[PDB]
Amino acid sequence: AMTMKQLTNSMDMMRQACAPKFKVEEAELHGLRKSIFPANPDKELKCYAMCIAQMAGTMTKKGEISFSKTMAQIEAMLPPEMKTMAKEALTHCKDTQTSYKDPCDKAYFSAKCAADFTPDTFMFP
């Protein structure tokens, strides 16, 4: 798997690829990295999160969060410091998207469920 430093480098690249497309600012982005997710973000932040999950190949053509490739991702890619938190969060949070129709809401609120469940060391790009 990746080391923590390699994962950070990969997450910074994802953020560089996605953030410029959306009307987001540094503070709210720093917040998600530190696993602090607003309950009521504006739409641009929700779609930033979707862009990210899409980029990590965790999103479906249907505009849904894919359990199976997320698991494969986590297994192959994550360092021990993140891997067990991510597996537990995915199982804990897998039904979140069913309360939402819009794909940006599915992505963002699934990631919020994960952020809220885990401690502050669980990073999002």
Burial level of 105, CB count in 10 A (0-12/13-18/19+)? Answer: buried
Phi-psi region of 63 (alpha: psi -120 to 50; beta: other; left: phi over 0): left
64 contributes a contact to Na ion by CB under 5 A: no
Closest by CA position to 82, among listed 69, 100, 70, 67: 70
| Residue nearer to Na ion on the CB measure, 58 or 110 | 110
Q: Which residue is associated with the tokens 């979707």? A: 50
Least distance between Na ion and beta carbon 29 (Å): 16
Shorter beta-carbon distance to Na ion: residue 21 or 79: 79
Whether 12 has a binding-site annotation, put simply, is no
DSSP 65: B
Nearer to Na ion, 67 or 122 (CB): 122
Q: Segment near Na ion (CB under 5 A), from 29-37, 52-60, 63-71, 100-108? A: 29-37
Residue with smaller CB distance to Na ion, 22 or 117: 117
- Asked if 122 interacts with Na ion (CB under 5 A), we say yes
Contacts of 94-100 with C-beta under 8 Å, sequence gap 24+, read 94/67, 97/64, 97/65
42 known member of a binding site: yes
* Number of residues in contact with Na ion under rule CB under 5 A: 8
Determine if 89 is a binding residue for Na ion (CB under 5 A): no
Q: How far apart are CA 77 and CA 97, in angstroms?
A: 24
Binding site for Na ion (CB under 5 A): 2-3, 6, 35, 115-116, 118, 122
